[PDB]
Design an enzyme around this catalytic site. Structure first.
Site, PDB file in Angstrom:
ATOM      1  N   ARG D 113      -5.123   0.361   4.959  1.00  0.00           N
ATOM      2  CA  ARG D 113      -4.765   0.150   3.566  1.00  0.00           C
ATOM      3  C   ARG D 113      -4.553  -1.336   3.313  1.00  0.00           C
ATOM      4  NH1 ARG D 113      -2.185   3.658  -0.636  1.00  0.00           N
ATOM      5  NH2 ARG D 113      -1.246   2.221  -2.169  1.00  0.00           N
ATOM      6  N   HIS D 140      -9.969   4.532  -3.423  1.00  0.00           N
ATOM      7  CA  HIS D 140      -8.852   5.300  -2.853  1.00  0.00           C
ATOM      8  C   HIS D 140      -9.346   6.745  -2.627  1.00  0.00           C
ATOM      9  CE1 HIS D 140      -4.983   6.303  -1.570  1.00  0.00           C
ATOM     10  NE2 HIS D 140      -4.247   5.993  -2.624  1.00  0.00           N
ATOM     11  N   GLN D 143      -6.919   9.885  -2.222  1.00  0.00           N
ATOM     12  CA  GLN D 143      -6.288  10.293  -3.453  1.00  0.00           C
ATOM     13  C   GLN D 143      -7.217  11.221  -4.269  1.00  0.00           C
ATOM     14  OE1 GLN D 143      -2.909   9.334  -4.705  1.00  0.00           O
ATOM     15  NE2 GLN D 143      -3.522  11.208  -5.803  1.00  0.00           N
ATOM     16  N   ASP D 236      -2.759   6.190 -14.414  1.00  0.00           N
ATOM     17  CA  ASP D 236      -2.202   5.366 -13.332  1.00  0.00           C
ATOM     18  C   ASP D 236      -1.531   4.156 -13.987  1.00  0.00           C
ATOM     19  OD1 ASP D 236      -1.530   4.445 -10.727  1.00  0.00           O
ATOM     20  OD2 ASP D 236      -3.542   3.729 -10.246  1.00  0.00           O
ATOM     21  N   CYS D 267      -1.741   9.788  -9.805  1.00  0.00           N
ATOM     22  CA  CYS D 267      -1.513   9.415  -8.414  1.00  0.00           C
ATOM     23  C   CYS D 267      -0.107   8.814  -8.541  1.00  0.00           C
ATOM     24  CB  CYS D 267      -2.507   8.355  -7.965  1.00  0.00           C
ATOM     25  SG  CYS D 267      -2.398   6.850  -8.938  1.00  0.00           S
ATOM     26  N   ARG D 295      -1.898  15.294  -0.866  1.00  0.00           N
ATOM     27  CA  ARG D 295      -2.284  14.099  -0.101  1.00  0.00           C
ATOM     28  C   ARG D 295      -2.328  14.397   1.420  1.00  0.00           C
ATOM     29  NH1 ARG D 295      -1.584   9.101  -1.644  1.00  0.00           N
ATOM     30  NH2 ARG D 295      -3.187   8.742  -0.051  1.00  0.00           N
TER      31      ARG D 295
END
Lengths: 308, 308, 308, 308
Positions: D113, D140, D143, D236, D267, D295
């Site tokens: 990440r 991502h 996600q 988001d 998310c 997740r």
């Protein structure tokens, strides 16, 4: 005994009464009980009885004795079989000997709760497998082991300890308690009406026990002299009432100890208001709930000792 | 709730009524049920309850509830203990509190089926272990979970679905069904005589439930308006008969749906010819047998969620 | 309580403070601790937490508390996750409630060490899994359990025992110790400056505790009367210094007991030369190292009791 | 493709972006996710990663992504290793290639990440083990899989479903969501300011995706036309604010769907009051908590597919 007998192994033995057990064998049983209690509380799971079967014959029903046998056996992977008075009338369709011989070819162990001590003896004799007395009108040996365990948990010892049983001093529970105390070097006093004094043949056998154990066994109808310095006050149900009424365990009675550390014990069930007051059994000296839990741990120990 | 509560973990919890459970907790229970049904049908064997014990107290006997608890627990290696009305009279020899405190020291979990909801509460309170309501005259939460499971199996969803309960709309089964429906966003209609309309305190609590869930809850004595577009018609036994007679589920009634996809459900046992006709319960819209199987899978799920 | 509550089962419970636990529940925890210590020393390896996960949130870092949680969980096959102040600022990027709801869907249990007691409560509330207080500025319950364990190891009992805490008598460690003592029927004396006397709401709750337990709880600024006959002298760090300086545990102070059997205890870390002298903490009455080891065994017990 | 490619096996593969995966491979991943969620909820414990190790490199810290990887791996007996920004500065003491070659000889799998997509590519290239993108400023992918899983749980299908992303329509999360939707035959609309319209190279690749999948992908700055008939509204965080302010998800916006069944997704973490109101995210259409739980289940699936 010139050569003192000191073995502890019990494999294959029955538990008909604690009179058949040495102090060393009972100490060994109490070690196992304590150890199995710790494994249970710590959730260390074992399978000691996997594949085995226990026939439980209840001539008289008891939920506590049933629960203790049934949880003890099945937590370890054994299978317990509940035979109720509706399932089984032991004198009725068949001789006891016929039933015992069959049981002997089918199960690993038999538990009996009922009337005659003779019934449990013949079960043992004719089945040829370990038989456990879960109460007869003579003895309740598993209760006595649980009581010992509880007392030792509370005082960290047994050899010193003064135990007073109040009331029906000759019933099954009082008798087994006296024996257990005598074996463990304890100071046991029986306190109740003279009509209900200890069985005399058992009392005399306990006087011989204590010569080797340095315990004491006694009877009096006088409350005051019984109770002074008692570490344990114990009682059981009454069912005349009129002879027993004075021997109720109440606050007054507990105070006659002269010791704040005194505990109260009762095999259960209790008739609260009769042999013990609500205030005592529900109050801070009561250890009846630990004593109840210890039924299971002691029964498991007896089964471990005798089957493995 | 300003911060909406959304946790699903149920470890240590009792099942006294679905009123004590969030929609998220019930959805989690239904996921487990569905998963345990698949493992059972596929013969994937597990030992989730190995070494554990469940005391089952039946004040009223039921073979379906007994079978469901007993198979659910023992398929996973647990040991269930059947205490019948002959074994145990809960008010009788002992206070309920005495019995609960003992049970608490001996077993992992208690199932109760009987009369008073108060009885199950005090079991939970005094034992300190998970207690499962296997039916009281107030609630039958395990039946409702099985009904939900069955409905979802049939329609692939719950949030839309219109469920009509016919007859004794205030009995234990009708009450728990209404709650379950409300929680899962379903459209529940109670249809029976005004004398037997839903309990009003439970009805009002369900009106609050559905404000968050977008379900609906309703009552009418009019068959025609209740049934139009029902996806589920449900009923239970009647035991006046004279007020209930009109609310028999027969072919005529099923047709009042206007939908061929409608299913018929009945917690069992049924008195065929009374609350439902033979033709309906034995015919192609009946889902009573899947519903019965789902008793076991839902009970296993409750025990998994609460013990592990 | 008219019916005294006596259950020991803790499955699903949090450990926010010992105020939430009965003497019977704490005794059960201490039995498990003792048993897990013996299994650890004997190298009997078990896997009680296999497959499980514990999130450890440290708002304030502590190596002892971390080591105890982390070794306790992982020796049994669990996976502990260390979230440091650098990982996690609980008020900062997200509400505490957002974080707790997520944690609740991901792990089996949460440990928290930090400032506000409210933080640990909301963790418990919003996660719905067992939460363990590994120290807040109000309470340090895991330390108190380890202290109890240590004292019992040394004297073979708790109910008699006189414990004196010296100095900052209202800090988290002093508060939890007072509660633990009160619960176990011990004679606890708080000895320090009046400015730092015990929290009064907690003190009064302990005066109610001891009415049932036959313990005592007390405060004095006078050293001489506090210490006479102390079986345990306990202290903790000071961070005015000027009010606390007189309450340093040194050789002079230890001798004020009048008993050679007196032990010295200190949650650690210590500032040697301040609240305790080198000579005392490094000398023959110190039991600080056993006390430290017992952090792990007590934590393991809490996790066993609450997760299994 | 003249011969259409339809294989599902992913053993040894990396997850750098969903652009590298076929619809059939993603469907296979979603099957595993759903199955691992059921095993987790039912407490069917497995050891799929026993003996394996996962290096997790966080150039940017995230507690949700960390928790998901770390619980997913360790529940199955794997060992996850948290390398923080303090542990590891990837350009700094060593070339990325040096670090990747070492990692390749020590662990089974790498999670990254951070910032540059190039970083994750070179990890994969130089380590030679499966690498998982746990977020870069381009994509991502984990996600998006969790979002798909959540949507399918809610509607029982994906191919029909209309998903609207509101605001910063070119950020990592919006981009991966668009791709996932396109792959699964969904109707995705990007709604935000023209300055922040979808990346055009990714948009065009999605227009090719949907020619085979019968999905649609679109952009508009007009709220009204975007939202009509949306089954999912997603958003988001925003970090000008001034271009994004109008695209706040509030009650008004949710109502523009014309459907009560619409869900809200995010998310996390959210800045409540900015991109979404408290009322919406905390209210009855929010599915953010299930989405968060998913997740873990999706990450476990990716690791199962690629390592076993």
């Amino acid at each position: 005994h010139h050569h003192h007998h000191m073995s502890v192994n019990l494999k294959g033995r029955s538990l008909l009464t604690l009179l058949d057990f040495s102090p060393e064998e009972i100490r060994y049983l109490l070690d196992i009980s304590k150890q199995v209690k710790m494994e249970n509380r710590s959730k260390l799971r074992t399978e000691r009885f996997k594949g085995m079967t226990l026939a439980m014959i209840f001539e008289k029903r008891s939920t506590r004795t049933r629960l203790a046998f049934e949880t003890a056996f099945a937590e370890e992977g054994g299978h317990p079989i509940f035979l109720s008075p509706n399932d089984i009338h032991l004198g009725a369709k068949e001789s006891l000997e016929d039933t015992a011989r069959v049981l002997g070819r089918m199960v690993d162990a038999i538990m009996f709760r009922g009337y005659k001590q003779e019934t449990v003896e013949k079960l043992a004799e004719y089945s040829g497998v370990p038989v456990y007395n879960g109460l007869t009108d003579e003895f309740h040996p598993t209760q006595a082991l649980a009581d010992l365990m509880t007392i030792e948990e509370n005082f960290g010892r047994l050899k010193g300890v003064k135990v007073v049983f109040m009331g029906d001093t000759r019933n099954n529970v009082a008798t087994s308690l006296m024996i257990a105390c005598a074996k463990m070097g304890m100071n046991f006093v029986a306190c109740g009406p003279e009509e209900l004094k200890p069985r005399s043949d058992v009392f005399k056998r306990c006087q011989e026990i204590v010569k080797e154990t340095d315990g004491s066994v006694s009877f009096t109808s006088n409350l005051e002299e019984a109770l002074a310095g008692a570490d344990v006050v114990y009682t059981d149900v009454w069912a005349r009432m009129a002879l027993l009424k004075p021997y109720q365990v109440n606050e007054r009675v507990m105070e006659m100890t002269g010791k704040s550390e005194t505990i109260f014990m009762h095999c259960l069930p209790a008739v609260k208001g009769q042999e013990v007051t609500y205030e005592v059994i529900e109050g801070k000296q009561s250890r009846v709930w630990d004593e109840a839990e210890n039924r299971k741990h002691t029964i498991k120990a007896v089964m471990i000792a005798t089957l493995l």
